[PDB]
Amino acid sequence: GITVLTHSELSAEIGVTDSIVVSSELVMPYTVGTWLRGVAANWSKYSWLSVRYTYIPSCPSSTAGSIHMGFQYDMADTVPVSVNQLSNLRGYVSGQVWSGSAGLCFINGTRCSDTSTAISTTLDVSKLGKKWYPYKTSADYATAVGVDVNIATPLVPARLVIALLDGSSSTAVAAGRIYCTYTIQMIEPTASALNN
Q: Does residue 195 bind Ca ion (CB under 5 A)?
A: yes
CA distances from 55 to 9, 93, 117, 155, 169 (A): 12, 10, 11, 26, 21
Give the number of C-alpha atoms closer than 13 A to the C-alpha of residue 75, restricted to the C-beta side. Answer: 23
74 contributes a contact to Ca ion by CB under 5 A: yes
Name the minimum Å distance from CB 123 to a copy of itself.
10
Q: Which of residues 60-119 bind a copy of itself (CB under 8 A)?
A: 60-66, 71-74, 76-80, 83-85, 87-96, 98-99, 101-105, 107-108, 110, 112-119
Tell me which of 4, 23, 50, 169 binds a copy of itself, using CB under 8 A: 4
42 is in an annotated binding site: no
135 is in an annotated binding site: yes
Closest approach, Cβ 23 to a copy of itself, in A, equals 15
Q: Is residue 71 near Ca ion by the rule CB under 5 A?
A: no
Single-letter amino acid code for the residue at 170 = S
Asked whether position 21 contacts a copy of itself by CB under 8 A, the answer is: no
Residue 195 known to bind ligand = yes
Our CA dihedral for 160, 158, 121, 186, rounded to 10 degrees, sits at -120
Burial of 25 per CB tally in 10 Å (0-12, 13-18, 19+): middle
Q: Which of 77, 81, 132, 192 binds Ca ion (CB under 5 A)?
A: 77
Contact call for residue 26 and a copy of itself (CB under 8 A): no
The Cα 171–Cα 153 span in angstroms is 35
Distance of alpha carbon 126 from alpha carbon 108, whole angstroms = 24
Chain contacts with Ca ion (rule: CB under 5 A): 74, 77, 134-135, 195
